[PDB]
Symmetry: C3
Subunit: 209 residues, 3 copies
């Protein structure tokens, strides 16, 4: 995927992701597909400006519970980190990613960011786009208009949204109990955030079981 | 171990650890067993209020030596992290664990905390309690009253206290040089902190060699 | 390598690295050998006092680009971390390493520090010195005076400088695409920092390809 990585001399370098053959715009995806990723990675994605300082602070200080605590990276931060060439993880690189995230949010709307996200992160088996992965893993499609191809299910969406946390380890064919827990949590959060309903939720929990 | 994990709506969720079949109270353990864990994880456990700010600061700024520097998590922090469902490690989750640790210290005494610790952390091979591990690995017991079962040795205590830092990697049967170094350091610290004496120390160093 | 590790009661403990059989002083190495490590780990090594606060801050805030951002550890910090016994990585240990780095910079000149670096970090296959590794991996030597032995090439220097980031994983014989990317970047930085020229750069890129 080196061609679709760089140093970010200008944020318009991300536009080159649009020329991938399996590129699919966020606009062209079903909501529950997008919400699988949003719910699992950065629930207030549409609301914040790349950092989610307010919501992070509430989830921390408002309840004793960890119910609202999320992972350490908003989707916008993840897009920066994945556009930058692969490198060792450190505080100094994280901070640069935060700085650049602000520049990405300044230039692009949430759907463009989300499109750069889903079409340039690693899903396993050499797939750096969400359509390549769905096709490869399930032979399904995340284009909501297709009349040609089976549409990605709720479960399969959750599976891919959880998978990108450890794409080389989490194995779709032989799912570990931990990968299974991750996906279960993803589904529940898709339900709580109203991307799916009880029926879908139960159908997906059944399929997973 | 999912049943004995949760979101901590209330700190009294930890009391459910008490119903594990192999539950053994800290009160019912030999001191050198407890000190194996305390010495290796959080020496001033009994003295601090969950954070060890004072002692951490001295170990840092008082001597050039690293002799008094410890790991990044007090036993109380470890109990929170292990009660929370398995999740990716991040700054935002660490901070929530610190917040909740303060609530745990407010409610419980040190022996209750230590009991929640030793009976709900992972020791390897599907063992989430210190008695299950001792029984499984050594066929020994950490109940100081048993007249029925061989009592866990000093070495075996150090081995398990070091093991929980990387329970899936550190292998009791075929010990790596690093695991071996960890255990050696544990024994020395058990000696320096007066949980064991020279005799015990040397007997354990002999057995390890 | 335990003998050449310790608690740093005094910074003069590092002088014992000088008695290693394959010890080679930085003074006795070709510049491009040293620059392979400097360029890849800490470009302003000679200029800063162990922390590189100024340059780190510029690389962060001056350009949107990540072009000048480096890894999270100056060579002096790396020498401390590697002199200290192997231990779990944490914020509290990192901070102690920073404190001691300042004491190392106070006592020693840059060539002594660089000599402690290259002669006590892990290169793979049981090699804790740069000469042991060059001899073992390539049968070459980093002593610039040798009339006896083939001299380490530009490529081989970059390979070893990148290798110490993950010495047990990066494999010289069967190089992963990532290890390959690391080395490529190292060479380019050796060129940009004027340790090598275009000819050398291209010869090394050819050999690597
Ligand atoms: C104090 C103040 C003030 C402020 C504080 C502040 C600043 C906010 C916080 C600062 C603290 C920050 C610190 C300390 C550090 C910053 O960094 C930390 C950590 O950064 P990351 O490690 O990048 O983040 C990972 O962990 C996060 C976390 N713990 O919070 C996370 C869960 O939030 C991230 O999740 C998401 N979604 O962002 C998680 O990111 C994921 O991390 C995975 C890596 O996991 C980790 O790295 C492994 C390296 O391989 C380590 O070994 C693990 O120990 C580690 O946890 C990324 O996966 C990797 O993706 C690569 C592209 C894969 O490599 C490819 O593999 C390919 C392959 O064929 N693989 C295959 C196989 O081999 C088998 C099947 C295959 O497909 C090829 O070999 C190819 O050549 C190769 O390039 C590679 O194989 C694959 N690795 C794994 C384990 O799956 C994966 O691609 C990446 N996903 C995305 C979307 O970015 C941070 O930013 O939080
Ligand atoms: C700036 C200001 C201001 C403030 C700064 C501030 C806030 C203070 C600091 C913030 C910075 C914090 C940051 C950046 C991050 C926060 O997080 C960091 C890091 O957190 P952790 O990674 O959780 O902490 C580990 O590292 C610490 C450290 N480096 O300082 C440590 C040494 O202090 C911790 O030690 C203790 N005792 O707390 C250490 O915790 C241990 O970490 C082990 C994991 O190591 C790490 O995670 C691995 C994940 O597997 C990674 O791959 C490693 O790269 C990584 O170092 C825990 O072990 C895991 O335990 C799990 C339960 C195991 O999984 C089970 O395995 C089972 C199994 O069968 N396994 C088996 C096999 O496969 C083979 C035999 C088996 O038994 C099953 O598969 C089962 O399904 C599965 O669930 C799993 O397999 C097992 N992993 C390993 C390697 O042994 C293990 O259970 C856990 N132990 C306890 C008691 O909690 C932090 O809090 O410091
Ligand atoms: C908020 C404010 C204010 C301030 C913020 C502040 C303070 C600045 C930041 C604080 C945040 C800090 C935090 C959160 C944490 C601090 O710590 C972090 C992380 O520390 P490290 O993990 O030590 O640093 C590594 O990562 C850095 C990074 N991400 O930024 C890095 C890239 O900058 C470092 O690179 C250099 N050059 O410093 C990198 O260090 C390297 O890290 C390697 C380890 O990688 C990591 O640790 C692995 C443990 O094995 C983990 O599994 C990985 O997940 C992890 O990334 C060191 O390598 C190890 O070297 C050991 C010596 C090897 O073990 C030996 O192996 C031998 C062997 O035979 N191996 C062989 C095989 O098995 C096969 C062939 C073999 O040779 C034997 O078994 C022997 O017994 C055994 O002892 C061991 O096998 C080998 N491991 C690997 C993967 O190669 C390796 O030796 C070490 N190199 C040097 C020169 O020190 C930090 O300081 O930044």
């Amino acid at each position: 995927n080196l061609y679709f990585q760089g140093h970010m001399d200008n944020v318009d370098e991300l536009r080159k992701i649009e020329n991938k053959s399996s590129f699919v715009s966020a606009d062209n995806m079903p909501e529950y597909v997008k919400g699988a990723f949003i719910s699992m990675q950065d629930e207030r994605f549409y609301n914040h400006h790349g950092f989610d300082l307010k919501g992070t602070t509430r989830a921390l200080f408002s309840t004793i519970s960890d119910r609202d605590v999320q992972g350490g990276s908003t989707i916008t931060q993840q897009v920066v980190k994945n556009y930058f060439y692969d490198n060792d993880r450190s505080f100094t690189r994280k901070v640069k990613e935060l700085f650049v995230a602000h520049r990405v949010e300044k230039q692009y709307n949430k759907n463009e960011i989300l499109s750069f996200y889903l079409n340039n992160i690693y899903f396993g088996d050499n797939q750096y786009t969400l359509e390549g992965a769905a096709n490869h893993y399930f032979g399904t499609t995340v284009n909501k208009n297709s009349t040609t191809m089976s549409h990605i299910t709720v479960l399969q969406s959750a599976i891919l949204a959880s998978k990108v946390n450890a794409p080389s380890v989490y194995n779709i064919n032989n799912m570990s109990e931990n990968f299974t827990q991750r996906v279960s949590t993803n589904l529940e959060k898709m339900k709580q955030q109203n991307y799916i309903n009880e029926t879908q939720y139960q159908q997906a929990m059944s399929q997973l079981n």
